[PDB]
Design a protein around this nucleic acid. Structure first.
Ligand SMILES: [Mg+2]
Ligand SMILES: [Mg+2]
Ligand SMILES: [Mg+2]
Ligand SMILES: [Mg+2]
Ligand SMILES: [Mg+2]
Ligand SMILES: [Mg+2]
Ligand SMILES: [Mg+2]
Ligand SMILES: [Mg+2]
Ligand SMILES: [Mg+2]
Ligand SMILES: [Mg+2]
Ligand SMILES: [Mg+2]
Ligand SMILES: [Mg+2]
Ligand SMILES: [Mg+2]
Ligand SMILES: [Mg+2]
Ligand SMILES: [Mg+2]
Ligand SMILES: [Mg+2]
Ligand SMILES: [Mg+2]
Ligand SMILES: [Mg+2]
Ligand SMILES: [Mg+2]
Ligand SMILES: [Mg+2]
Ligand SMILES: [Mg+2]
Ligand SMILES: [Mg+2]
Ligand SMILES: [Mg+2]
Ligand SMILES: [Mg+2]
Lengths: 328, 547, 49, 132, 194, 138, 77, 101, 257
RNA sequence: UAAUCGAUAAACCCCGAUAGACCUUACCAACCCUUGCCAAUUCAGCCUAUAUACCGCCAUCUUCAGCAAACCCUAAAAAGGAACAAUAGUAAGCACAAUCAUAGCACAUAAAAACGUUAGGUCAAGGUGUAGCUUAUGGGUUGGAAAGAAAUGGGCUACA
């Protein structure tokens, strides 16, 4: 299928030129972020699966990596490990073992000469380097891979890295390394806002069990809550609901140092109490140092409550309660 | 209009896209036949479509009824039946069986129905409209004059005109639209009296206080075309008089003048200037097809330019077509095909090859397919300017366009290769085209011998003698032998390739059929034998020739 | 009106425009059953005759 | 076991189309609807009429083009004019194809009191998506 | 005899205008579309099916006749039909004082042979009572005459007429209702003094 | 190169009647899928910006109608099949419109309306005052 | 579009009291017929001519059943 | 023909109800009121009883269009629960899809 | 009534009951006669009962240079056409009802000794045209499965030979009889023996061999004693190229052994 | 009682029915019509039998993972095909998984769950092969289809 992909490349180039001409943009500056945008407009297919939508990419992404020819016209295989089944993986293993042996002999000679110039280049914790996954290795090597052979390759790579690294060995071992994303879970702290000559003004939002609450906090007033135009004592007759309001302020010892006005809609009494508690906790982050906001998030004030009522299932009573199952 | 797009009426699928003009006509005819068949079922079974769902109640899609509503009442049974031939004839008999009195308006429709559709039955109907009831002459002549004209009986129109003028009733403008034709169509050694009768009728037209419309001035020019080719003075005088009253002449009015000018332009070319300077004034305005006889206007106004070999005027006559209505001026496809072919006949050899090719792609595959005549002119356009890169492009389109005419255009399509030089960069174009024409005729179709001489020189400069030699064997076995010029030319290629084994087989078969240049071939082979050191075989073929 | 649809489709099938596979199968099965020997009895003789 | 709109898997040699290879629970996920109209919206009406017209069109076209139809028709309803898109095997000559399309364009129009458009795409054979 | 004709893709020019080949809504014929587009769920070892014979591409509505270039070309010709909005009513504050009457009219479009929609007859009238010549007694009488149709927070009287079959008849009836409500609010009868 | 000449032949007349004035024109297009609505909204805003209408676009909340039917044919009520119908809404707001401008906009809007969507049009007709309320005394 | 309701206006639909002249003004017939006129006025599915048929049918029925209205004890015309 | 003799009877019942709709409405207008004296109400009841049986709109049954199933039908599509599923699973009905939430 | 109809594919699938639940485990085989007839075989799309000749379907579109109008055949022409259509039905039924007799290698109702044709060519392109093969034994083998229970699989012994001294044998087991035949044919050529034939008609010397439990005594014979051996040994020797031989098999008569 | 039917172990028992005063209703008693819905048909029509002939739709194993075309091997082969410091296994495909939906992730739910077992349910959603009705097992009108001696399944109300 070597010629088929080549023909598809020319057809894709011609189609890209035509798409640029019909869309009105410069074909020279036409890129994939414009190709997909124009496709989504010309063929607006509304489907839940993204892969089912129309797509026009370069053939190298659409078609998978096709295996190259292995033997010439005379039938003689090119690579010397063709009859091993996996001529790419086994060649890689052979090269890795040869480099390991070269490193070992060079280190033995250096120790005989009583010289130590190498360093430990295996600790990549600050960089955030990891080993290749099976899919990543199968992307590099066109042939299919297994689990045991992948484990052997990883365990040989770590053996090679555990030895005094050479000059050309480090770059070879680095191409099998992948960077990981930031695992920091620190939330964004809203800056203090000053609106209408008002100092220490902040806003927060919360949601819990179909209840939306928006709370504005002023850091210069006394401690009181105004909910929906009425005081919290009147709006929450139940003491537990008022304890929900007290939970964030008591954790920060800011009972009588902030004035809060809340607007909460939806849900019941407890759902509204939870929503306003979450909104107040998220809004108080601006008035507190970075040390206690983490304490609040560890105490469970800055995290949402995904506990939502499950939909009732057909043939059941309450999405869990089954009907009376008669054995006979 | 798009360039590489088929007309909207045909399906856009390539398997349904027509290839030739006959296929294009046949597909439309088949589709119209299916439409008519469906309408036949709709009319024959009205009850299956009586239910209406569309709120606006569109009447165009409702079935039509062919049955008259009232049958017992003679008066009411004729109006329904006249509007819908043979059955209308029995209506008069059924009404007259009861001796029902017919007014002057009921019989007019019956007479018009017979006049529109339909020799002795006409007289039998004409006696029944006159002897039965004193009908008004206005309802008489409109049927009689218009019916007897198609029956080759114009003598009755003049007799009826005498009664019409005696009855103190003025003749409408439509009466003289046929009286002049009836008077003119009969010619017995005289023309001046026939033309003077038309002049007398025209003079009486104004006295009758009826303004003659454009139809009278259009029909006098219709009559002045068949008889005399020198009668252009009265035609031009009438054309001038048309502008005096204030009504613009129609397209057919100029078409009739152009037809006679085309007739008279063959002996003298001085009349072509009058043809050229009359269309300039009419191209400056936007026209509308208000006359059904305007189809031949462009057919005659562009054939003159095609015959006189004018392109600056062809551009203007095409602009005239494209100005007002690009399609509402040609009725039938035959006229369009005959128009575009000779229109493109002038765009090839006059202007440059670039503009010729530019106009080629927007007219040939888009509008209509050329005939066998345009193919010759397209070939003539290439060899004059030495255009060889576009030869395969024209050839591949010609396979689908002139496949029927291939057997007559193939001897001419390949002759251009013998006049130009073959560059070393043009080997594949000469190879694939020569292979595709040889792969079809030998698999089933006379094969001209001239193409072998062309294919011999196509591979001469390409250095491919292996493929060139094998084709000669296919022709020499077909019981036909070409001239020795090809053999002598290919002997040079064989000498260049150092293949003495080819000429020995060539001559032993060539000299056996008594070729006129066998002496030259036998002299030429001795020249190659000495340089190829084939003196042992030089006398070997001499012995065979002697034996 | 199912009668309109049925009559129109049957008339088109008889005229040669629509091809009804279900009705063709019914006709084939009826032909085979009649050839076997168990057809449609005539009205007025099924019980008495 | 679910059996609605589901073609059972054979030994591994039967040809199936893209629409047939997807179960009905993949509708609006991997494959779309064969017909589009405004009758199945929230505040609209006249849905039963559209459904019965669509099913009559299916049954009529199946007999109109017997043996040459590749897959299910596409019925688009857009502003009082109804478009019918079909995929047909190139078994019949274009002379007969044009006759059939001209017959249908008028018969359906006069039967449903609305303008119709008929579009056919010729295919050499049925397109195979899964194992054949 | 079987014939296979290549599509327009080999003949499409790179700079040829697009709206000429797709002037109106089209069923997306693959032969006239030079863009190679693959639509459909790909196979594990395969690729999404091409445009030829792909029912997925035919199912969806195509916007090839509504490219931005075609939209600009169409609107250039449509600029001649529209009129220029007067600048004297840039802000709604002047619009309220110049045209206090508001007529809400509903229009619906649906695919099908039928056009009648029962919700088309609905015409709503909105009049701000702050822009009328009502006196104190007239306003107090009109408020009670209309009842809940007039709000106090916004002070806008609303008329909801649906009795007439035709939309024009409903509009005329709403105008008549406004006229009589304004006129009868000034008439003081004998039962008002009690 | 074969471009026809004089292809623009419109018939536009200016009647002496005052043109109708519209305050707000709301177009609520309802459909099943979101890609079609997004493409239609892009087309509508691109058409409106050229005419200079200052169109406002916002997405009203969707509505999902679900129902339940028997899974089997004769007798199985414990197992059910649930069907769903989604309806997505797109709202286009036009302000400061005239009678002819609204007509010409709706011409280019409705003629190219997709088959799978419907449209509700609400017009805020502008009037000053009726003749019997200008300055009457009974 | 295509429907004009015979060119009628709102006063041919809302106002139907002009058709109640051939009825007793003070009797229960007026009380009964005012409701049907109010219903017809608010009915948009019927035409002005169609409502004329209903009111004329009521006129005919009441004027045909004469013995019952006299026997009911209330004078009616 | 029709789907079933029951459907053929039901369509006749609907036609008769359409024919007698106005007369039944006019008669019921004389029965559903208290203004009129009770003497004529009994005569109106006798007149409405004298009407043909298949004229009342209470005899109509909303059966399926395709299969004439007396029960398990949806009013919006006028189809039975089984024909509706058969048409929806093939994707022949727009906007209809399996509910997954 | 029109909406109540279905398609011919579903009609035949329901009528034949090919996927019935009673024919799975083995309760069927009582009426083993499955025949599906295509009703669209000889039906012209233009022909009909009323005999209309449409210009686009029945008759050519253009005749004598003009257009043809809607025409209808006469009653006699319609009778002739329907008579030809009926004749086609019985003509096809004649071909359908005719069954060619099967090969009788050893008996009329066995597969032992029947010809199976030359084996399929190899991947590299070698074609075995001179090779002829014969079936020695066909046996229905059953296996007990957890879900289905009995699992019937046909095992076939197939021997190939060219008549020049090269021959072999193989066993092919498959669910279907044709698949087993194909597997055995394609696998027999891989195991080929060469048999030394004295004067290409007999063996060099008498051989008395004792296999697992089968004793074979073969004696050299002159030109006049042609293949007086077991009914399968004769076929094997005919495939090999041996024309004269006497063989006696004692003990077990297992075909494979 | 003159007065339907089917389901009737897990997988039936507020099940067909998201639904019975006439109609629904296929049940019965009294009465009428027999080319009797359709353009026509020595034809229509049958809720007549066969779910042990079916398709269409499902139940159970079943949130179990196996099924399976093409090959190859076994000192024969009914059948089996594995040792990762690897001892004959490659394997397209269907399953599983992933993805999708509950408009952001994760979880959960939903959805999906192959090949087959139960001759499991459904001729009464609809058509149907075979065998049976045609002045009747077909088509219409009216009136009735109770009632509880008793047992039991599932729910609501409570026994505070
Ligand atoms: Mg519960
Ligand atoms: Mg039935
Ligand atoms: Mg035998
Ligand atoms: Mg024995
Ligand atoms: Mg029961
Ligand atoms: Mg039972
Ligand atoms: Mg059970
Ligand atoms: Mg009854
Ligand atoms: Mg009952
Ligand atoms: Mg019965
Ligand atoms: Mg069963
Ligand atoms: Mg597994
Ligand atoms: Mg095995
Ligand atoms: Mg596998
Ligand atoms: Mg998600
Ligand atoms: Mg998960
Ligand atoms: Mg589930
Ligand atoms: Mg899964
Ligand atoms: Mg059973
Ligand atoms: Mg049962
Ligand atoms: Mg049945
Ligand atoms: Mg039964
Ligand atoms: Mg109980
Ligand atoms: Mg239950």
């Amino acid at each position: 299928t070597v010629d088929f992909i080549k023909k598809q490349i020319e057809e894709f180039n011609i189609g890209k030129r035509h798409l640029a001409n019909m869309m009105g943009e410069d074909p020279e500056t036409f890129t994939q972020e414009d190709i997909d945008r124009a496709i989504a407009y010309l063929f607006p297919s509304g489907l839940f699966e993204k892969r089912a939508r129309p797509i026009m990419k370069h053939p190298e992404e659409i078609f998978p990596k096709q295996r190259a020819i292995q033997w010439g016209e005379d039938g003689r295989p090119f690579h010397f490990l063709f009859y091993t089944g996996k001529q790419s993986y086994y060649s890689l293993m052979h090269d890795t073992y040869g480099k390991l042996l070269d490193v070992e002999k060079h280190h033995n000679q250096l120790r005989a000469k009583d010289l130590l110039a190498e360093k430990t280049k295996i600790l990549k914790d600050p960089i955030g380097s990891r080993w290749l996954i099976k899919e990543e290795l199968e992307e590099m090597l066109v042939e299919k891979l297994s689990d045991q052979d992948y484990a052997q390759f990883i365990r040989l790579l770590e053996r090679l890295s555990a030895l005094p690294c050479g000059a050309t060995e480090e770059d070879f071992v680095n191409r099998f390394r992948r960077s990981i994303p930031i695992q920091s879970k620190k939330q964004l702290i809203e800056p203090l806002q000053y609106d209408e000559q008002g100092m220490a003004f902040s806003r927060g939002e919360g949601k819990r069990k179909t209840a939306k609450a928006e709370v504005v906090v002023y850091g210069q007033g006394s401690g009181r809550i105004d909910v929906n135009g009425v005081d919290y004592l009147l709006y929450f007759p139940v003491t537990q609901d008022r304890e929900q309001l007290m939970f964030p302020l008591h954790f920060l010892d800011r009972l009588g140092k902030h004035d809060m006005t809340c607007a909460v809609s939806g849900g019941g009494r407890s759902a509204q109490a939870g929503a306003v508690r979450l909104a107040m906790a998220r809004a108080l982050c601006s008035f507190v140092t970075e040390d206690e906001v983490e304490w609040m998030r560890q105490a469970g004030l800055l995290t949402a409550d995904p506990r939502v009522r499950e939909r009732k299932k057909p043939g059941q009573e309450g999405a869990r309660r089954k009907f009376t199952w008669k054995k006979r | 209009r798009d360039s590489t797009a088929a007309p909207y009426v045909f399906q856009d699928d390539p398997y349904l896209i027509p290839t030739s003009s006959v296929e294009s006509h046949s597909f439309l005819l088949a589709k119209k036949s299916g439409e008519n068949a469906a309408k036949f079922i709709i009319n024959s079974y009205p009850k299956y479509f009586q239910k209406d769902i569309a709120e606006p109640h569109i009447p165009c899609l409702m079935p039509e009824y062919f049955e008259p509503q009232i049958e017992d009442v003679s008066e009411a049974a004729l109006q329904e039946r006249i509007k819908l031939x043979x059955x209308x004839x029995x209506x008069x008999x059924x009404x007259x069986x009861x001796x029902x009195x017919x007014x002057x308006x009921x019989x007019x429709x019956x007479x018009x129905x017979x006049x529109x559709x339909x020799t002795w039955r006409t007289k039998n109907n004409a006696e029944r409209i006159f002897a039965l009831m004193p009908e008004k002459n206005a309802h008489s002549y409109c049927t009689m004059i218009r019916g007897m004209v198609k029956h080759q009986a114009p003598t009755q129109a003049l007799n009826l005109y005498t009664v019409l003028l005696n009855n103190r009733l003025r003749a409408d403008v439509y009466t003289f639209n046929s009286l002049i034709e009836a008077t003119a169509l009969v010619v017995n050694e005289k023309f001046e009296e026939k033309w003077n009768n038309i002049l007398d009728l025209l003079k009486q037209m104004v006295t009758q206080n009826v303004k003659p419309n454009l139809q009278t001035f259009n029909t006098i020019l219709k009559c002045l075309r068949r008889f005399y080719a020198f009668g252009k003075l009265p035609a031009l005088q009438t054309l001038r008089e048309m502008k005096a009253i204030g009504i613009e002449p129609s397209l057919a009015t100029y078409h009739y003048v152009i037809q006679l000018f085309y007739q008279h332009e063959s002996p003298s070319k001085g009349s072509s200037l009058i043809i050229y300077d009359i269309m300039n004034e009419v191209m400056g305005k936007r026209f509308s097809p208000r006359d059904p006889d305007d189809d031949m206007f462009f057919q005659s106004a562009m054939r003159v330019c095609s015959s006189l070999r004018d392109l600056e005027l062809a551009y203007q006559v095409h602009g005239l077509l494209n100005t007002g209505d690009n399609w509402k001026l040609i009725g039938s496809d035959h006229r369009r095909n005959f128009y575009y072919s000779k229109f493109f006949n002038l765009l090839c050899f006059m202007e440059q090859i670039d503009v010729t090719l530019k106009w080629y792609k927007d007219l040939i595959p888009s509008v209509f397919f050329p005939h066998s005549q345009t193919m010759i002119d397209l070939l003539q356009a290439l060899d004059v300017a030495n255009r060889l890169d576009m030869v395969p492009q024209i050839w591949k389109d010609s396979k689908e366009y002139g496949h029927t005419f291939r057997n007559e255009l193939k001897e001419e399509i390949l002759m251009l290769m013998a006049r130009d030089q073959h560059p070393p960069e043009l080997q594949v174009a000469f190879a694939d085209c020569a292979a595709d024409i040889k792969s079809t005729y030998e698999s089933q179709p006379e094969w001209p011998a001239s193409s072998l001489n062309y294919v011999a020189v196509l591979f001469l400069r390409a250095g491919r003698t292996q493929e060139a030699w094998k084709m000669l064997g296919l022709f020499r076995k077909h019981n036909k032998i070409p001239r020795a010029e090809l053999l002598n030319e290919f002997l040079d290629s064989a000498k260049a390739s150092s293949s003495p084994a080819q000429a020995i087989e060539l001559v032993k078969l060539a000299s056996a059929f008594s070729l006129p240049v066998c002496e030259g071939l036998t002299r030429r082979v001795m020249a190659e034998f000495t340089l190829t050191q084939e003196q042992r075989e030089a006398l070997g073929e001499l012995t065979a020739l002697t034996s | 009106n199912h009668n309109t649809y049925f009559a129109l489709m049957g008339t088109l099938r008889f005229l040669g425009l629509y091809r009804d596979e279900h009705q063709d199968f019914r006709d084939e099965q009826l032909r085979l059953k009649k050839l076997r020997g168990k057809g449609k009895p005539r009205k007025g003789e099924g019980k008495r005759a | 076991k679910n059996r609605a709109a589901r073609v059972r898997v054979s030994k591994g040699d039967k040809p199936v189309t893209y629409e047939e290879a997807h179960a009905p629970h993949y509708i609006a996920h991997r494959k779309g609807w064969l017909s589009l109209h405004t009758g199945n919206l929230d505040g609209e009406d006249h849905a039963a009429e559209r459904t019965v017209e669509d099913v009559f069109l299916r049954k009529f076209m199946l007999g109109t083009f017997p043996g040459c139809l590749a897959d299910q028709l596409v019925l688009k309803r857009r502003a009082n004019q109804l478009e019918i898109c079909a995929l047909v095997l190139r078994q019949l000559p274009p002379h007969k194809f044009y006759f059939l399309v001209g017959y249908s364009e008028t018969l359906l129009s006069h039967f449903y009191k609305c303008p119709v458009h008929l579009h056919l795409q010729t295919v050499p054979s049925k397109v195979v998506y899964k194992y054949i | 005899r079987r014939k296979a004709l290549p599509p327009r893709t080999e003949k499409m020019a790179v700079d040829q205008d697009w709206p000429s080949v797709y002037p109106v809504a089209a069923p997306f014929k693959p032969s006239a579309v030079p863009l190679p587009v693959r639509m459909g769920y790909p196979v594990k070892r395969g690729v999404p099916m091409a445009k030829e014979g792909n029912l997925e591409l035919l199912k969806i509505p195509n916007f090839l006749h509504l490219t931005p270039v075609a939209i600009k070309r169409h609107c250039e010709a449509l600029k001649d039909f529209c009129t220029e909005w007067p600048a004297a009513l840039d802000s709604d504050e002047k619009c309220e004082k110049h045209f206090p009457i508001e007529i809400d009219t509903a229009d619906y479009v649906s695919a099908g042979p039928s056009i009648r929609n029962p919700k088309a007859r609905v015409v709503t009238l909105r009049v701000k009572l702050s822009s009328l010549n009502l006196d104190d007694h007239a306003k107090k009488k009109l408020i009670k005459l209309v009842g809940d149709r007039y709000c106090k927070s916004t002070d806008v009287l609303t008329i909801k007429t649906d009795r007439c079959p035709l939309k024009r008849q409903n509009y005329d009836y709403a105008v008549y209702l406004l006229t009589v409500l304004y006129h009868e609010s000034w008439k003081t009868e004998e039962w008002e003094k009690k | 190169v074969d471009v026809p000449k004089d292809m623009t032949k419109p018939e536009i007349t200016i009647s002496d009647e005052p043109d109708t004035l519209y305050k707000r024109l709301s177009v609520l297009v309802k459909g099943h899928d979101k890609a079609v609505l997004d493409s239609y909204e892009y087309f509508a805003v691109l058409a409106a910006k050229e005419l200079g209408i200052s169109i406002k676009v916002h997405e009203p909340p969707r509505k999902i109608e679900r129902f339940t039917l028997l899974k089997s044919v004769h007798i199985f009520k414990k197992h059910r099949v649930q069907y769903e119908m989604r309806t997505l809404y797109r709202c286009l707001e036009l302000e400061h419109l005239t009678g002819s401008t609204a007509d010409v906009y709706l011409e280019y809007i409705q003629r190219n309306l997709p088959e799978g969507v419907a449209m509700e049009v609400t017009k805020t007709k502008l009037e000053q005052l009726p003749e019997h309320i200008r300055k009457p005394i009974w | 579009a295509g429907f004009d309701d015979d060119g009628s206006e709102f006063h041919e639909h809302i106002f139907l009291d002009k058709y109640l002249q051939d009825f007793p003004k003070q009797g229960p017939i007026r009380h009964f017929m005012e409701l049907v006129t109010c219903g017809l006025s608010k009915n948009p599915y019927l035409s002005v001519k169609q409502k004329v048929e209903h009111i004329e049918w009521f006129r005919n029925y009441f004027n045909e059943k004469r013995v019952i209205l006299k026997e009911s004890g209330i004078q009616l015309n | 023909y029709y789907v079933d003799w029951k459907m053929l009877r039901d369509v006749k019942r609907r036609k008769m109800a359409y024919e007698y709709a106005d007369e039944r409405l006019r008669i019921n207008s004389l029965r559903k009121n208290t203004i009129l004296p009770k003497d004529l109400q009994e005569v109106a009841d006798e007149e409405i009883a004298s009407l043909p049986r298949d004229s009342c709109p209470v005899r109509i049954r909303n059966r399926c269009v395709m299969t004439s199933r007396p029960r398990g039908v949806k009013r919006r599509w006028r189809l039975s629960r089984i024909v509706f599923r058969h048409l929806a699973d093939h994707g022949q009905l727009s906007g209809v899809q399996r509910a997954m939430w | 009534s029109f909406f109540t109809k279905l398609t011919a594919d579903e009609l035949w699938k329901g009528a034949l009951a090919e996927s019935g639940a009673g024919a799975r485990k083995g309760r069927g085989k009582r009426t083993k006669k499955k025949r599906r007839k295509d009703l669209n075989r000889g039906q012209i799309i233009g022909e009909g009962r009323h005999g209309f000749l449409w210009p686009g379907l029945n008759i050519p579109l253009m005749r004598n240079g003009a257009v043809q109008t809607i025409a209808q055949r006469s009653k006699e022409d319609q009778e002739k056409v329907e008579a030809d259509m009926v004749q086609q039905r019985e003509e096809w039924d004649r071909r359908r009802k005719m069954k060619v007799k099967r090969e009788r290698g050893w008996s009329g109702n066995t597969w032992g000794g029947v010809s199976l044709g030359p084996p399929d060519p190899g991947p590299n392109g070698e074609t075995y045209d001179d090779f002829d093969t014969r079936i020695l034994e066909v046996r229905n083998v059953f296996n007990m499965t957890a879900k289905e229970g009995r699992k019937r699989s046909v095992r076939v012994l197939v021997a190939v030979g060219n008549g020049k001294g090269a021959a072999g044998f193989a066993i092919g087991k498959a669910t279907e009889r044709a698949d087993a035949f194909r597997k055995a044919k394609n696998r027999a050529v891989h195991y080929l023996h060469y048999i030394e034939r004295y004067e290409d008609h007999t063996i060099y010397h008498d051989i008395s061999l004792k296999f697992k439990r089968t004793h074979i005594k073969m004696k050299k014979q002159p030109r006049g004693y042609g293949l007086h051996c077991h009914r399968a040994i004769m076929t094997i020797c005919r495939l090999i190229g041996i024309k004269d031989l006497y063989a006696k098999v004692s003990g077990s008569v297992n075909m494979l052994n």
